[PDB]
Paper text:
β‐1,2‐Glucans are natural glucose polymers produced by bacteria and play important physiological roles, including as symbiotic or pathogenic factors and in osmoregulation. Glycoside hydrolase (GH) families related to β‐1,2‐glucan metabolism (GH144, GH162, and GH189) have recently been created by identification of two β‐1,2‐glucanases and a β‐1,2‐glucanotransferase, respectively. Structural analysis of the proteins in Groups 1–4 revealed that they possess (α/α)6‐barrel folds similar to those of GH144, GH162, and GH189 enzymes. Overall, phylogenetic, biochemical, and structural analyses revealed that Groups 1–3 are new GH families, GH192, GH193, and GH194, respectively, and that the three families belong to clan GH‐S (clan GH, classification based on structural similarity) as GH144 and GH162.
Author numbering: 20 to 443
Write the structure that this text describes.
């Protein structure tokens, strides 16, 4: 029970993930997750938000399980680079998670971290989105050690299977038999009003996962339908004599289209990924023009926080004439996300950005928001840093997920469900 407390004061992945073009800059952003920078010493989870003025940091004492998933997968990659401290940390982190209060097995959003333990936020909110995300994270973590005869790694495996098994009540809880979709979650003891009803958003992993972990329960098996029946909408544009048909995220925000791609090889599993390629190029053009990064939910330049999307890449605007987010600001993590679609142009772009704005670099990472005029946030966010770094690791995290799904009999289910991912 009494153990030494390791300090991760160095964090490095394998060499293959660092572009020749861009090594240092990835390390800088990766360094966010060093102990004492972006990671809390007492709970050993990343802070939700930092403020950095001159390599001195202020901290918002919150976290969520999406930030923790990404942290985990990164740790795995540091472990593969040969960091033995990371393997200890992965076990400390699983303990935390096992200790975190839950609701029918599902994690809360957010977790308050003020005490030195995870308290559920005042809402008592239990979202499908965060539990979907973390389900795949743990798959990838298990995916990475399933071949190990090391008994410590075997241990991690069994602990992850347990923790996912425990979520069965939660997932069953969330299955509306009438609408045939997942409710969005639980909030203060009550089902949340809305449903997981669009493939083109973050919450799709939950819908993907529920059928899998409940596959065996026979009569009460949650149907694939919870994923398949979800709607997918594009819009058909033309530009300088070329057609684009971009997949529309609800609020136009990049992250909803490409976050899941950190865990799943969506570029192969989707029949025609062209829509994603198109959403990407349109984002890439709007970015280049406004001399700022691509656009997703992020910090503001004055340290608020706001969804940000391109109106013409937004379902709500295009489809329902309801504009719910601006394209005033860009964020580095959205440009880095795009390395999962086009890695050459992503590095060019981020490099282009740092040439224009040399002050964007801090020792905790690049700042989260950059205006078209060149104004900038003081905030750096664990969510965005995890997405930034994870984009570059996705090939390795994707392979591990697939290994997991193959071992658990899930892989054909996933592929089948992906057959449905096509423009309605």
């Amino acid at each position: 029970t009494l153990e030494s407390a390791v300090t991760l004061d160095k964090l490095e992945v394998r060499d293959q993930f660092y572009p020749a073009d861009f090594r240092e800059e990835l390390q800088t952003n990766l360094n966010f997750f060093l102990d004492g920078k972006g990671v809390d010493a007492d709970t050993l989870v990343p802070y939700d938000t930092i403020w950095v003025k001159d390599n001195k940091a202020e901290y918002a004492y919150y976290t969520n399980t999406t930030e923790i998933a990404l942290y985990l997968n990164i740790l795995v990659e540091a472990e593969k680079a040969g960091n033995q401290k990371a393997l200890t940390r992965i076990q400390e982190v699983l303990t935390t998670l096992e200790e975190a209060p839950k609701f029918k097995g599902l994690f809360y959003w957010p977790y308050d971290i003020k005490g030195g333990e995870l308290k559920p936020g005042k809402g008592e909110i239990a979202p499908a989105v965060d539990n979907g995300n973390l389900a795949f994270s743990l798959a990838a973590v298990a995916g990475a050690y399933l071949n190990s005869t090391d008994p410590v790694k075997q241990s991690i495996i069994s602990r992850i299977d347990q923790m996912l098994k425990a979520q069965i009540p939660g997932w069953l809880s969330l299955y509306d038999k009438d609408r045939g979709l997942l409710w969005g979650g639980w909030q203060n003891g009550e089902l949340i009003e809305y449903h997981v009803d669009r493939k083109a958003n973050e919450s799709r992993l939950a819908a993907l996962w529920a059928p899998l972990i409940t596959k065996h329960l026979g009569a009460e098996a949650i149907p694939a339908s919870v994923f398949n029946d979800m709607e997918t909408y594009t819009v058909s544009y033309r530009l300088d004599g070329k057609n684009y048909t971009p997949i529309l995220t609800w609020d136009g925000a990049y992250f909803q289209a490409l976050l899941p791609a950190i865990w799943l090889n969506e570029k192969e599993l989707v029949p025609d990924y062209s829509m994603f390629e198109d959403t990407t190029q349109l984002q890439r053009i709007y970015s280049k023009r406004n001399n700022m990064p691509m656009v997703s939910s992020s910090a503001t330049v004055n340290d608020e926080y706001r969804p940000f999307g391109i109106p013409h890449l937004s379902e709500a605007w295009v489809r329902y004439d309801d504009k719910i987010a601006g394209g005033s600001t860009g964020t580095p993590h959205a440009t880095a996300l795009s390395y999962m679609v086009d890695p050459e142009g992503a590095v060019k772009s981020l490099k282009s950005i740092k040439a224009l704005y040399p002050a964007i670099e801090t020792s905790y990472g690049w700042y989260d928001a950059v205006d078209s005029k060149g104004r900038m946030s003081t905030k750096i966010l664990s969510l965005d840093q995890g997405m930034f770094v994870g984009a570059f690791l996705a090939e390795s995290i994707n392979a591990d997920v697939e290994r997991y799904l193959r071992a658990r009999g899930y892989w054909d289910d996933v592929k089948s469900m992906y057959l449905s991912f096509k423009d309605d």
